[PDB]
Amino acid sequence: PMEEEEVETFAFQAEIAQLMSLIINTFYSNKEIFLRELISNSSDALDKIRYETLTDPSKLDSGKELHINLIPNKQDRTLTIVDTGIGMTKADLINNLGTIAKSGTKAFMEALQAGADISMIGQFGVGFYSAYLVAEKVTVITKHNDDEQYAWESSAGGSFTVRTDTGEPMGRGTKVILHLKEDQTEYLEERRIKEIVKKHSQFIGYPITLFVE
Numbered sequence: 001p002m003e004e005e006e007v008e009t010f011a012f013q014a015e016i017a018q019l020m021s022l023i024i025n026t027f028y029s030n031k032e033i034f035l036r037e038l039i040s041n042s043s044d045a046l047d048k049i050r051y052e053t054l055t056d057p058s059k060l061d062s063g064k065e066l067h068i069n070l071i072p073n074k075q076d077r078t079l080t081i082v083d084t085g086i087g088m089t090k091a092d093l094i095n096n097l098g099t100i101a102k103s104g105t106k107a108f109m110e111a112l113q114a115g116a117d118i119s120m121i122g123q124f125g126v127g128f129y130s131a132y133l134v135a136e137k138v139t140v141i142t143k144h145n146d147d148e149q150y151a152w153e154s155s156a157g158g159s160f161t162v163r164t165d166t167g168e169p170m171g172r173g174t175k176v177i178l179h180l181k182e183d184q185t186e187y188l189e190e191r192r193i194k195e196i197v198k199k200h201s202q203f204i205g206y207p208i209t210l211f212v213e
């Protein structure tokens with residue numbers, strides 16, 4: 001048979017759609033904090049599975065290794081983050097990545113117009129959107145125990161898609177692929193990735209491996 005795959009198209013909650021616009025169509029220095037934000041979500045999802053793990057070891061039969069991979073590809077112009085954390089069910093994605101309103105959205109947008117540092121993004125509960133400071137498209141692949149694997153993808157423009165993922169399986173965790181803008185290729189550079197990591201991510205308690213082409 002010719003392949004047939006299922007897709008669902010969603011609208012970003014109105015206010016999150018505003019934030020994303022602000023984020024993309026405005027200039028901010030200190031963009032490197034996007035990598036700090038990624039690594040912290042990865043680290044939080046890793047905490048989660050490890051906590052569940054204390055009580056139910058079979059929770060790890062989908063993966064015993066707790067770590068975070070970094071993978072820049074200049075050919076594709078992608079920076080990919082990979083962790084072996086808790087993962088996301090379908091609901092988690094939909095409710096966490098765009099559909100549902102965030103308490104922090106209105107305040108953060110205001111704080112930015114008042115001249116606040118883009119770096120505050122995380123504090124206001126919307127740090128995942130820091131990805132659009134450097135990326136024109138973002139793909140999120142995730143696998144949670146007792147559920148299937150999903151792909152979530154957006155180029156912003158107020159919309160996003162979700163689909164049961166047929167691609168390469170990950171046992172468990174989330175993978176985030178950032179398709180960098182052209183002015184932001186500096187984040188595909190090994191030297192700059194190590195510099196950002198060593199500066200902003202030294203509190204992280206899981207090994208970070210950087211794969212270098």
Ligand SMILES: COc1cc(O)c(C(=O)N2Cc3ccccc3C2)cc1C(C)C
Pocket residue numbers: 038039041042043044045046048081083085086087088128140142173174176
């Ligand atoms: C790198 O971006 C991510 C990495 C992730 O592992 C995760 C993730 O799967 N989780 C689950 C979880 C559970 C408790 C607390 C936080 C989180 C985030 C998410 C992202 C971003 C796409 C938000």
